[PDB]
């Protein structure tokens, strides 16, 4: 019949078709290899009597490239930092935007290396939040097939030194995904909308980089208990608080980028963040008991081999009302004095030094 004529056209019409964009792409990719004008998209949905665009150039110019001749506006959503022709004055290609100066890299660790073994004492709580955070990362498809969207907001409250920061980074390392840390106590900015702008680009950065871990510290500092006096009514910080609120539902579909909020006293929050779709998993972080404190400092001093056969039982007796941070300070205080004490007696003075 009629194949051999059709495909001798088709395969020829396939390869020559693709070769000319290979020529063209080059002809525009060198232009895409030389863009010079930022894309302050001031869009018009100019339906041809489809779309169109206005580009505020870097040199303070504006160029109305018709119908956006190269990039679809579905991916070319407005903003800035999207390739524009230096000669053709056309949109060239999307490229990463700017992450609000501070948010570009505030304290973002690319990959944490702390392991879950070096932390402990609250193993029931750490396993609880691993099931609520780490499992929604590795076995995310299990939740997708089950039909239950995993919760995202985990609030980890407890006195300082309970290992919240290590646990959050250890969980992020286990997920093998992006980890973003927020300096909560310093989000209160005199500039208007600055903290609101910072949190936005932090969420934007987290969305653009994998299912991330948004580790916001000092949630009590971020959100007041609404105890309103004229001394301070939490007026300008209510700005940023509801901003964090409206970005908690930004990642509801596909259930990525979890929010972990660390504080000491959960009671200093109004019933805004304690929401089921918002921060819902509140996990207690108590001071470890004598057994847990002894185990924690033993794990810390595992990399130290100076004094053999130290059961740390007297240390557990003398470690009354101490944090995991205090236990680490106690053990490394031995790590500073155990030169040339030594066994079961170079540990007490660590707490005494701080006060």
């Amino acid at each position: 019949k009629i194949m051999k004529s059709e495909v001798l056209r088709v395969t020829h019409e396939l390869q020559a078709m693709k070769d000319k964009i290979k020529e063209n792409s080059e002809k525009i990719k060198v232009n895409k290899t030389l863009p010079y004008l930022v894309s302050n998209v001031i869009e018009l949905l100019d339906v041809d009597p489809g779309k169109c665009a206005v580009i505020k150039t870097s040199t303070r110019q504006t160029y109305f490239l018709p119908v956006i001749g190269l990039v679809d506006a579905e991916k070319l959503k407005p903003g800035d930092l999207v390739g524009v022709n230096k000669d053709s004055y056309l949109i060239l290609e999307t490229l990463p935007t700017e992450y609000d100066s501070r948010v570009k890299a505030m304290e973002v660790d690319e990959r944490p290396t702390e392991q879950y073994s070096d932390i402990g004492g609250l193993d029931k709580q750490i396993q609880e939040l691993v099931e609520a955070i780490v499992l929604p990362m590795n076995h995310k498809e299990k939740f997708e097939n089950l039909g239950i969207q995993p919760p995202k907001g985990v609030l980890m409250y407890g006195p300082p030194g309970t290992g919240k920061t290590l646990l959050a980074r250890a969980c992020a390392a286990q997920t093998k995904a992006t980890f973003l840390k927020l300096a909560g106590p310093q989000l209160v900015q005199m500039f208007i909308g600055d903290g609101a702008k910072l949190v936005r680009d932090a969420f934007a950065l987290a969305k653009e980089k994998a299912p991330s871990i948004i580790f916001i510290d000092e949630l009590d500092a971020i959100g007041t208990k609404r105890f309103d006096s004229e001394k301070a009514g939490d007026r300008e910080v209510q700005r940023t608080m509801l901003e964090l609120l409206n970005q908690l539902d930004g990642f509801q579909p596909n259930t990525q980028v979890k929010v972990i909020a660390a504080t000491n006293r959960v009671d200093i929050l109004d019933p805004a963040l304690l929401r089921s779709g918002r921060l819902d998993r509140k996990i207690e972080f108590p001071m470890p008991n004598e057994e847990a404190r002894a185990r924690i400092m033993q794990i810390h001093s595992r990399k130290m081999n100076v004094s053999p056969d130290v059961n740390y039982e007297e240390l557990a007796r003398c470690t009354d009302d101490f944090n995991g941070a205090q236990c680490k300070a106690v053990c490394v205080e031995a790590g500073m004095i155990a030169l040339r004490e030594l066994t079961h007696e170079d540990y007490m003075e660590g707490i005494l030094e701080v006060q």
Binding site: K1, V41, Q238, L245, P271, R275, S276
Partner: protein, 370 residues
């Protein structure tokens, strides 16, 4: 058949494909495409002379050559110019606030507004402020009055304001503008009130626009003593907003729905009648309303007919529907524990007491109403 079926493979691979030679030409067409400079015609000098401001550079004057329909061009229209061709080669309409456009045209798939209980009074308030003015202007014509402008919602942070805003947004999904009232700040001194005028002009273009913005307290304030340059930018932004919504020229068929958490710190100039026609406080959910929300949240839950909902109502008090999906959730991974297919009433009791003990800690759960 070998000469038949081997054909049916090869042309399908293309069709949508092998659509490259013209894409190549189009982008080559772009390569030698002239980029025509863009300005706004301030005023028409003569019938053939038109005073046009470049968006950045100086005002030039240009002139349509033979057929560019100089009559339809108006002071403030958008035209394309070239520093070489000396004329306007074609004309172009306007803009639509793109950043605002997508974040106001990306309303997620929500449920109907009937899926939230205890706010039927608020639902009918929304109907007689949005639907009634446009469906039946003849009755109000016999009345002889203008429809009201806007309504305010305020109360505890957990009421259903976001659900109601998303539900009304999903009702239209085409002429609904969502504003978060915080992306107004930017690096430059400009583009603060320029955007605000722009979607107001967008609201002028489309009559039945429903404008929703949240946290008026994020721009409101009471009074700035020893104001900073950032504080001073609020007050001019607030003043520009006030004189563009009430001002001298009013809007038509445009209604503003706004919500916040601190009604007392709001500026008294905005909340006076004329700008905010109605003020509505969304109170604590009722005990039977909480029962309905609990049933809604426990719809797709594997459970049998032994649940003591009345016990939950008696124990759970002062808890918004937010705390109720927590209880529904907390019963969820309690059911995950020990690997139980169904959910037992004891899991709900554990959820209720755990949430109740969670809520004990926090004080000042709600601001007093004004």
């Amino acid at each position: 058949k070998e000469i038949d079926g081997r054909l049916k493979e090869l042309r399908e691979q293309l069709k949508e494909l092998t659509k490259q030679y013209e894409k190549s030409e189009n982008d080559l067409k772009a390569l030698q495409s002239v980029g025509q400079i863009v300005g706004e015609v301030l005023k028409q000098l003569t019938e053939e002379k038109f005073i046009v401001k470049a968006t950045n550079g100086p005002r030039y004057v240009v002139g349509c050559r033979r057929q560019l329909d100089k009559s339809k061009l108006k002071p403030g229209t958008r035209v394309a110019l070239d520093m070489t061709t000396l004329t306007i080669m074609r004309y172009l309409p306007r803009e639509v606030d793109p950043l605002v456009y997508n974040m106001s045209h990306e309303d997620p798939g929500n449920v109907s507004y009937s899926e939230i209980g205890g706010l039927s009074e608020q639902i009918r308030e929304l109907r007689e402020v949005i639907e009634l003015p446009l469906t039946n202007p003849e009755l109000f014509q016999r009345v002889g009055i203008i429809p009201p402008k806007g309504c305010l919602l305020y109360g505890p942070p957990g009421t259903g304001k976001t659900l109601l805003a998303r539900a009304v947004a999903s009702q239209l999904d085409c002429n609904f503008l969502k504003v978060v009232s915080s992306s107004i700040v930017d690096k430059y001194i400009g583009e603060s009130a320029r955007l605000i005028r722009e979607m107001f002009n967008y609201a002028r273009d489309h009559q039945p626009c429903i404008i929703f913005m949240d946290e008026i307290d994020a721009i409101g304030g009471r009074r700035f003593s020893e104001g900073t340059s950032a504080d001073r930018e609020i007050q001019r932004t607030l003043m520009e907003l006030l004189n563009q919504m009430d001002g001298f020229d009013t809007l038509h068929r445009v209604k503003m729905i706004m919500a916040t958490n601190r009604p007392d710190t709001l500026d008294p100039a905005l909340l006076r009648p004329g700008r905010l026609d109605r003020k509505i406080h969304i109170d604590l959910p009722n005990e039977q309303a909480r029962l309905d929300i609990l049933k809604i949240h426990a719809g797709p839950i594997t459970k049998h007919g032994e649940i003591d909902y009345e016990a939950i109502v008696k124990l759970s008090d002062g808890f918004n529907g937010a705390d109720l999906r927590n209880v529904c959730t907390e019963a969820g991974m309690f059911a995950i524990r020990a690997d139980h297919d169904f959910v037992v009433q004891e899991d709900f009791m554990k959820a209720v007491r755990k949430v109740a003990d969670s809520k004990k800690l926090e004080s000042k759960l709600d601001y007093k109403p004004v």
